[PDB]
Amino acid sequence: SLSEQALNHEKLMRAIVKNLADTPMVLKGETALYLGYGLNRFSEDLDFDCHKKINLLGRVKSAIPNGIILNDIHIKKDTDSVGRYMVRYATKDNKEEQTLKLEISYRDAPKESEVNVIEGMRIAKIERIIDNKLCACFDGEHTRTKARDLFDLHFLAKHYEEHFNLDLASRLKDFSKDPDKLVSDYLVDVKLDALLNQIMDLEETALELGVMAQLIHKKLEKQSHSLNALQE
């Protein structure tokens, strides 16, 4: 769009992720879609998988780009299974303190062969992002109700349909079968979410996703039925 505040935020996020390209850290989730795959809404948090501990504090400080001032890094959590940091910073454009949230999950880690590199950044593959989005908003242990999940899944079905398999498509179809329910579930969150409220038509998105999920699932079935006949 994009505000000057957002621009400095993106610049700090990019420097950090690029700094970690020689570590086993893998960017996932929403900001992976934004920095790596062309997501058309902004994203502000950094989320990683990593199979072992690293010098996070050191890499972050050595990543700080010109124009950004690092005030403090607060370690909310550093355990065997999770890392959670609040990177507090200001800019030359503004001395008002901003926060970058950085989270890491350990032994979630993708195999090294499940990692992409995009513009010098280690990022999760699309199918893993899809799988994790569906878990979080539809069929995981602890689901949630955040309109971003709908926006992102719609973005994924629309622009990356070739990365869905039968299982992902089937779940996406299940999730999106009742477009009215989706509107009911998300309308409040959409209007309150400043990353969405000016760009998202919730009704259109809900309708369009339900139908795309049908198509994707249908194509994959026809592909399967066709493959079998050919195999004989």
Residue numbers in the entry: 11 to 242
From the paper:
JHP933, a conserved putative protein of unknown function, is encoded by the gene in plasticity region of H. pylori strain J99. Our work demonstrates that JHP933 is a nucleotidyltransferase superfamily protein with a characteristic αβαβαβα topology. Most NTase fold proteins can transfer nucleoside monophosphate (NMP) from substrate nucleoside triphosphate (NTP) to the hydroxyl group of their second substrate, such as a small molecule, nucleic acid or protein. The molecular details regarding the function of JHP933 are unknown due to the lack of sequence similarity with other well-characterized proteins.
The final crystal structure of JHP933, containing residues 11–243, was refined at a resolution of 2.1 Å with a Rwork and Rfree of 20.43% and 23.08%, respectively. The overall structure of JHP933 consists of two domains: an N-terminal core domain and a C-terminal tail domain. The N-terminal core domain covers residues 11–170 and contains 5 α-helices (α1–α5) and 7 β-strands (β1–β7). The C-terminal tail domain is formed by α-helices α6–α7 followed by an extended α-helix (α8). The N-terminal core domain of JHP933 has an αβαβαβα topology formed by α1-β1-α2-β2-α3-β5-α4, which is coincident with the common α/β-fold structure of nucleotidyltansferase (NTase) fold proteins. A Dali search for structural homology identified lincosamide antibiotic adenylyltransferase LinA as the closest related structure with a Z-score of 9.6. By comparison to the active site of LinA complex structure, a conservative large cleft is identified as a possible active site for substrate binding at the N-terminal core domain of JHP933. This substrate-binding cleft is surrounded mainly by β-strands β1, β2, β5 and α-helices α4, α2 with a size of around 13×20×20 Å. The corresponding residues are G39, D55hD57 and E113 in JHP933; with G39 at the connection of β1 and α2, D55 and D57 located on β2, and E113 is placed on β5 structurally adjacent to β2. Therefore, with reference to the structural conservation of these NTase superfamily proteins, the conserved G39 should play a crucial role in binding of substrates, and D55/D57 and E113 likely are involved in the coordination of divalent ions such as Mg2+, which chelates the phosphates of a nucleoside triphosphate substrate and plays a crucial role in activation of the second substrate's hydroxyl group.
